[PDB]
Amino acid sequence: DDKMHIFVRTLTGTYIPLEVEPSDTIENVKAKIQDKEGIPPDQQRLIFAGNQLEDGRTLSDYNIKTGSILTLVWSLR
């Protein structure tokens, strides 16, 4: 039950809360973002600590912890 609660900041101003695991992949987070907000995964770019979160890597690989805020860019559409 050691799930961490993180947030996704959009350019609209909202913050989407997500209950995730450290082993969740970036594409899994994008799928959750699509489910909650509708943005297609292939048009999402996630930024955290000045890094573009690449697919296949996990949140733990970027030291994403409870209360982390990931900036979402809705580009290429």
Binding site: D1, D2, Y15, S68
Partner: protein, 151 residues
């Protein structure tokens, strides 16, 4: 559950501030951590800080709102209750903090402290001394500091 109990309240407060801000202050996270917020306060008109925009940092404890947040000025200000490190003496930030007190109320209390300082029970003894002995000097110095650092 870690500190999710605090994060629920923090997100709710952020939503409340975004939907209806006081229009004389703002607050929200500008970084990568929901526990760390930036706030801005407009200087009151009835104070020598009129026209200045003062920036503050808010650090939420992991068990918010049971413990008060750590609020500190980042813009330099000339005030007898705010030291050179930005610490604020409000008596509701460590001693009489109760749940159901919001960050918005903390900002309003800080604005009121800016409007009417507290000579006795000071944080900076020298500024309090100048405030008690010469009001014109204090107001002029505060205006100069507001123009230099908050404008």
């Amino acid at each position: 559950p870690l500190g999710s109990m605090a994060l629920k309240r923090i997100h709710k407060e952020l939503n409340d501030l975004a939907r209806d801000p006081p229009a004389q202050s703002s607050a929200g996270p500008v970084g990568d951590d929901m526990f760390h917020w930036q706030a801005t306060i407009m200087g009151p008109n009835d104070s020598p800080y009129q026209g200045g925009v003062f920036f503050l940092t808010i650090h939420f404890p992991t068990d918010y709102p049971f413990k008060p947040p750590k609020v500190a000025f980042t813009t330099r200000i000339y005030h007898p209750n705010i030291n050179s490190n930005g610490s604020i003496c409000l008596d509701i930030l460590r001693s009489q903090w109760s749940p159901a007190l919001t960050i918005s109320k903390v900002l309003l209390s800080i604005s009121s402290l800016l409007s009417d300082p507290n000579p006795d029970d000071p944080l900076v003894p020298e500024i309090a001394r100048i405030y008690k002995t010469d009001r014109e000097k204090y107001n002029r110095i505060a205006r100069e500091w507001t123009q230099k650092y908050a404008m």
